[PDB]
Amino acid sequence: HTLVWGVWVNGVDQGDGRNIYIRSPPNNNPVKNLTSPDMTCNVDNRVVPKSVPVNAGDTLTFEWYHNTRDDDIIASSHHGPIAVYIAPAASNGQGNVWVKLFEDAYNVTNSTWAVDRLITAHGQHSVVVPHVAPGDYLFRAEIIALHEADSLYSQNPIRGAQFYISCAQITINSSDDSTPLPAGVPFPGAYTDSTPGIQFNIYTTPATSYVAPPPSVWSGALGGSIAQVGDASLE
Numbered sequence: 379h380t381l382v383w384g385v386w387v388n389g390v391d392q393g394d395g396r397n398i399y400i401r402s403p404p405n406n407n408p409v410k411n412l413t414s415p416d417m418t419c420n421v422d423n424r425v426v427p428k429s430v431p432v433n434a435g436d437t438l439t440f441e442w443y444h445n446t447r448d449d450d451i452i453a454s455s456h457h458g459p460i461a462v463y464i465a466p467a468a469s470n471g472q473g474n475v476w477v478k479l480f481e482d483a484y485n486v487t488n489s490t491w492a493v494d495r496l497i498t499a500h501g502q503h504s505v506v507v508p509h510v511a512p513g514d515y516l517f518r519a520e521i522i523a524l525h526e527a528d529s530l531y532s533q534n535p536i537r538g539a540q541f542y543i544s545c546a547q548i549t550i551n552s553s554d555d556s557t558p559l560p561a562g563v564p565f566p567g568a569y570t571d572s573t574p575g576i577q578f579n580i581y582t583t584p585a586t587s588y589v590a591p592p593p594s595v596w597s598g599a600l601g602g603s604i605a606q607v608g609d610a611s612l613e
């Protein structure tokens with residue numbers, strides 16, 4: 379159970395984004411139904427009044443939280459991967475539009491899942507804004523918690539992989555559009571019951587064997603990481 383509080387750009391807090399520039403759902407409950415429209419931008423997908431201005435090469439940092447800002451972030455039981463996608467705002471997330479900018483699942487040398495590291499990072503994980511066409515975008519951050527993903531939701535609706543999905547309205551101002559945005563995938567649609575990484579048993583299978591759901595990260599993606607960039611408590 380987790381939600382996005384807001385974002386930072388180049389290490390500078392853009393302020394509380396909830397229902398402002400984040401298309402916030404009313405609570406931190408997971409989405410589980412892979413075929414639901416809720417998979418796109420969670421259960422209250424609508425245009426919110428602000429969109430965060432950025433330029434290509436900027437560092438865009440999502441900040442997540444559990445109940446209050448900079449708390450325990452997400453329950454440590456929720457081991458799983460983290461991905462970030464982008465689509466043009468004109469789509470409203472419909473169609474084959476989502477392009478993957480970041481993937482992190484399991485890190486063998488630290489023996490930590492992405493979620494484990496997110497907690498350590500005070501909820502913060504980042505992407506570098508790519509050289510796409512200037513305009514309005516949705517950046518869709520997705521945490522998948524696997525602690526009940528030995529079952530499929532389609533078969534047993536009280537279990538299944540849990541998706542914490544958040545869409546930020548982002549305006550890209552300065553960019554040379556030298557890596558124009560390619561073909562992406564649909565949500566809902568990309569993840570099905572057979573997709574690698576959707577059904578997995580974290581209690582018996584080694585994490586080193588885990589493969590995250592495709593698609594793979596776009597070659598045009600400029601970077602990213604799970605790591606605290608800013609100290610919320612200083613505000």
Ligand SMILES: *[C@@H]1O[C@H](CO)[C@@H](O)[C@H](O)[C@H]1NC(C)=O
Pocket residue numbers: 411412413414415535
């Ligand atoms: C999953 O979502 C689909 C698409 O909206 C819907 O038809 C189906 O009833 C949902 N499953 C459950 C258990 O609600």
Ligand SMILES: [Cl-]
Pocket residue numbers: 405407
């Ligand atoms: Cl509810």
Ligand SMILES: [Cl-]
Pocket residue numbers: 408409410411414416
């Ligand atoms: Cl659901």
Ligand SMILES: [Cl-]
Pocket residue numbers: 427428429430
């Ligand atoms: Cl605005």
Ligand SMILES: [Cl-]
Pocket residue numbers: 445446447
């Ligand atoms: Cl708070």
Ligand SMILES: [Cl-]
Pocket residue numbers: 498499500604605606
């Ligand atoms: Cl960190």
Ligand SMILES: [Cl-]
Pocket residue numbers: 434509552553554555
């Ligand atoms: Cl540029």
Ligand SMILES: [Cl-]
Pocket residue numbers: 437504505506601602603
């Ligand atoms: Cl980064």
Ligand SMILES: [Cu+2]
Pocket residue numbers: 379380408453456
């Ligand atoms: Cu939860």
